[PDB]
Amino acid sequence: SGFRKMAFPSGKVEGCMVQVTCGTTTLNGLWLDDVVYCPRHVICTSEDMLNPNYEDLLIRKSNHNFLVQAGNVQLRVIGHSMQNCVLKLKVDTANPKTPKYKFVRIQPGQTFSVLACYNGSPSGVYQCAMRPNFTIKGSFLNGSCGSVGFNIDYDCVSFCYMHHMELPTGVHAGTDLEGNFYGPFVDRQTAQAAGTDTTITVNVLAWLYAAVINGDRWFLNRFTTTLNDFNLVAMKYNYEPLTQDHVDILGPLSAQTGIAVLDMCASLKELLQNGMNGRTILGSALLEDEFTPFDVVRQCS
Amino acid sequence: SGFRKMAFPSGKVEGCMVQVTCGTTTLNGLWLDDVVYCPRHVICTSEDMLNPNYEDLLIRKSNHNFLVQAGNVQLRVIGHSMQNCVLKLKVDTANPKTPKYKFVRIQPGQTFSVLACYNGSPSGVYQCAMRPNFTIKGSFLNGSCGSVGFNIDYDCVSFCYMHHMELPTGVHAGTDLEGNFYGPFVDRQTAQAAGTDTTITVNVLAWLYAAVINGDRWFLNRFTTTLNDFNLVAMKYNYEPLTQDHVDILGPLSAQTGIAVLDMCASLKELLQNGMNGRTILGSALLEDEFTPFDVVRQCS
Numbered sequence: 001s002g003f004r005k006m007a008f009p010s011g012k013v014e015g016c017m018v019q020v021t022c023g024t025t026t027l028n029g030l031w032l033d034d035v036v037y038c039p040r041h042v043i044c045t046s047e048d049m050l051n052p053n054y055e056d057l058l059i060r061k062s063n064h065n066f067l068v069q070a071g072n073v074q075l076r077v078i079g080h081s082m083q084n085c086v087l088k089l090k091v092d093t094a095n096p097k098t099p100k101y102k103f104v105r106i107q108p109g110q111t112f113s114v115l116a117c118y119n120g121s122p123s124g125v126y127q128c129a130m131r132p133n134f135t136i137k138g139s140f141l142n143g144s145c146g147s148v149g150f151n152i153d154y155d156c157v158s159f160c161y162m163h164h165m166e167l168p169t170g171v172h173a174g175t176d177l178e179g180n181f182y183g184p185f186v187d188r189q190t191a192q193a194a195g196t197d198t199t200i201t202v203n204v205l206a207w208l209y210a211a212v213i214n215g216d217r218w219f220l221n222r223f224t225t226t227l228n229d230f231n232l233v234a235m236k237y238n239y240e241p242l243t244q245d246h247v248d249i250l251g252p253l254s255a256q257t258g259i260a261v262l263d264m265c266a267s268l269k270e271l272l273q274n275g276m277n278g279r280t281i282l283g284s285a286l287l288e289d290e291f292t293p294f295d296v297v298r299q300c301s
Numbered sequence: 302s303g304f305r306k307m308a309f310p311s312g313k314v315e316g317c318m319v320q321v322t323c324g325t326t327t328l329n330g331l332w333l334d335d336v337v338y339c340p341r342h343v344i345c346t347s348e349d350m351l352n353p354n355y356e357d358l359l360i361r362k363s364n365h366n367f368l369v370q371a372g373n374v375q376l377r378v379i380g381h382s383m384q385n386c387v388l389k390l391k392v393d394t395a396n397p398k399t400p401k402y403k404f405v406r407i408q409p410g411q412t413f414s415v416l417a418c419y420n421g422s423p424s425g426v427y428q429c430a431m432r433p434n435f436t437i438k439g440s441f442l443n444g445s446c447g448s449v450g451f452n453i454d455y456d457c458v459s460f461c462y463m464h465h466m467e468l469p470t471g472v473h474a475g476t477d478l479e480g481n482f483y484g485p486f487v488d489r490q491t492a493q494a495a496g497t498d499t500t501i502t503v504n505v506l507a508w509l510y511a512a513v514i515n516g517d518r519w520f521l522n523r524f525t526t527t528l529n530d531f532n533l534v535a536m537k538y539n540y541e542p543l544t545q546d547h548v549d550i551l552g553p554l555s556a557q558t559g560i561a562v563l564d565m566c567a568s569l570k571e572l573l574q575n576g577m578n579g580r581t582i583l584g585s586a587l588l589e590d591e592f593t594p595f596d597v598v599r600q601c602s
């Protein structure tokens with residue numbers, strides 16, 4: 001019993017973190033097989049940050065412009081290339097700790113664990129969600145660029161995020177491990193702002209189910225609704241539309257608790273319309289939306 | 302920027318988790334050097350839960366009554382002893398993945414990371430605090446007994462908790478790695494209840510300092526308070542007393558932010574009186590008390 005925000009065990013990823021230095025810039029890299037992955041903005045100096053020409057910056061670089069350090073051991077760089085916004089450094093040594101892995105691009109609303117690192121050294125791990133506006137509400141200080149996000153499926157590490165930048169709101173932006181940004185962002189120092197965010201409705205429903213499983217039942221009621229009526233409420237309160245696919249995904253939790261999704265939607269409708277009346281759900285006074293249905297099943301069953 | 306409940310990277314502890322079986326009971330153990338630590342109630346049968354005599358149960362056991370599995374490798378037990386409520390199994394192989402470590406007993410209010418495990422296999426990592434009533438608000442299911450809590454300040458793992466049992470309210474109780482319980486609890490299934498819990502005042506103040514460091518000042522006010530007047534008020538909201546030690550502990554954060562400790566106490570008094578009027582602090586609509594002054598300095602700029 002109990003319900004906590006839980007991250008995946010990070011050991012398999014810890015063995016892949018290295019330090020990458022180009023000139024006076026030092027950040028984190030991911031060492032898998034004989035390649036190190038890091039943000040391409042490592043090749044930028046301060047005179048380049050506002051309008052970098054990454055093509056020209058890279059062709060000017062040679063292998064000897066990069067220092068890769070794995071703990072106390074220097075890895076010799078024997079090749080370099082760019083894939084989108086990620087720099088790929090070929091090294092002369094394959095990482096003996098490389099886990100079974102794949103690169104996976106996630107969708108908004110999906111969750112993942114982040115291994116926050118500084119100077120190639122793992123510092124902490126936390127769980128977060130890709131927001132509908134394609135930012136993440138991370139916790140990053142200067143030097144965390146290149147920290148990665150991941151899930152573990154059976155025994156395979158699915159890498160889904162590399163950290164690139166902090167936006168003026170304090171939220172964070174990054175890419176998949178193939179260098180494609182999440183969200184309408186570019187790797188430059190320029191006027192960039194997160195769009196207005198929305199709440200991840202299917203995750204809120206998942207968390208209400210977790211609340212019921214844990215004995216919190218005060219928000220349940222006799223009423224049911226329709227997708228159509230609920231989605232007009234959702235739009236009203238800046239909640240993502242609920243789709244039929246979302247309903248099917250919650251099917252398991254609906255079957256285990258006796259509260260059909262549209263039954264629970266009537267609870268959520270009511271909580272949006274009237275509120276929590278001074279009460280809490282799972283120790284929170286806000287409606288939590290960074291647990292997926294998968295996350296709830298994994299932790300509650 | 303940003304602020305997350307952040308756990309320590311769990312790899313150093315993952316490499317120590319094993320499975321221990323005696324009879325039909327299987328739970329987790331901690332393999333360090335040539336010793337495996339686990340809860341002594343692994344030697345109980347269904348008849349031995351209310352009033353076990355562990356001395357009498359253990360003297361009946363041979364080394365070969367204990368099955369220890371490290372992943373796929375069965376470890377040979379060559380000796381056993383009981384230290385308070387922890388069973389220690391000597392094995393014929395020292396764990397090659399043993400990290401730098403030590404055993405520490407913590408005080409209420411202290412935080413640590415938990416690596417939740419089932420059948421000797423890590424499932425997830427989360428952050429938590431020793432409550433003033435000597436329980437922890439964990440997320441544990443059947444089979445998690447023997448999971449451990451730890452910190453990793455610097456490169457040394459400090460083991461401070463081993464999980465033994467769930468109480469009727471769903472909170473959790475356990476021991477230090479010398480087998481001494483936190484709080485008045487015992488390893489019997491007789492009715493035991495956690496005392497009334499209270500809010501960890503010094504941690505709430507640390508988290509308000511974190512909010513200021515991250516750029517939020519909306520909750521400050523023009524007032525101050527004496528220590529005694531603060532405690533008279535806060536105890537009416539079931540907050541723990543604030544001692545002069547706590548005031549001294551908050552000295553560095555007071556210096557970094559320019560807000561005197563007793564001025565921040567005046568702000569907390571007003572927050573308890575007013576609530577947040579629709580606002581949040583570091584993303585929360587309630588006052589968070591599971592970040593210590595040390596944690597805030599660790600994670601914040």
Ligand SMILES: O=c1c(O)c(-c2cc(O)c(O)c(O)c2)oc2cc(O)cc(O)c12
Nearest residue numbers: 026027041143144145165166187188189
């Ligand atoms: O927010 C940013 C940021 O943090 C870094 C960064 C991270 C590190 O870890 C470093 O060591 C470093 O030198 C820079 O680069 C950036 C580059 C941009 O074009 C835009 C940004 O917004 C950032």
Ligand SMILES: O=c1c(O)c(-c2cc(O)c(O)c(O)c2)oc2cc(O)cc(O)c12
Nearest residue numbers: 327328342444445446466467488489490
């Ligand atoms: O709450 C308890 C509990 O969970 C376990 C336990 C944990 C496991 O992981 C097992 O596999 C197992 O068989 C028992 O023992 C207990 C023993 C007590 O005297 C009292 C308890 O309250 C528990």
Ligand SMILES: [Cl-]
Nearest residue numbers: 406407408411
């Ligand atoms: Cl302590």
Ligand code: NA
Nearest residue numbers: 221223263266
């Ligand atoms: Na209903």
